[PDB]
Structure 1
Amino acid sequence: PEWMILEAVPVLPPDLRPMVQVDGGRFATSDLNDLYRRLINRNNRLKKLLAQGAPEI
């Protein structure tokens, strides 16, 4: 049951959530990339905040 509480978070392969430019030079990307990204910012910010000694709040 404890597996339902996730420690390591699986990350989908790049070609499944691709980022590629098109005609006109402009780029294109999946929303999953941005989601994963924000998850990463929050996780790393918390990561350094825990080692920081920041207050419980």
Structure 2
Amino acid sequence: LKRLKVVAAFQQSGNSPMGMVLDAVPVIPPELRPMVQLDGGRFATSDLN
């Protein structure tokens, strides 16, 4: 049963299991992961960078 939940979930059209493996990774816009200069000449970046 627990397996059929997954497989049946993928049975409907427009939805393929192939998406579970990525050949391309998206990149979030830079404003959402910004980089700011600090007092002391150093910089701070989001961990995402």
Measured against the shorter chain, the TM-score band is 0.5 to 0.7
Letter of the structure 2 residue corresponding to residue 27 of structure 1:
F
Query: Structure 2: which 5+ runs fail to align?
Result: 1-16
The root-mean-square deviation of aligned C-alpha atoms, in Å, is: 1.1
The TM-score with structure 1 as length reference comes to: 0.50
* TM-fit CA distance, 1:9: 0.5
Instruction: Tell me which protein shows more helix as a share of its residues.
Output: 1
Q: Provide the rounded CA distance (Å) in 2 between the counterparts of 1:26 and 1:6.
A: 35
1:9 matched residue in structure 2: 25
Instruction: Tell me which protein shows more strand as a share of its residues.
Output: 2
The list of structure 1 runs, each at least 4 consecutive aligned residues, that deviate by more than 4 angstroms after superposition, is: none
Query: Structure 1: which 5+ runs fail to align?
Result: 34-57
The TM-score with structure 2 as length reference comes to: 0.57
- Greater Cα radius of gyration, structure 1 or 2: 2
Aligned length: 33
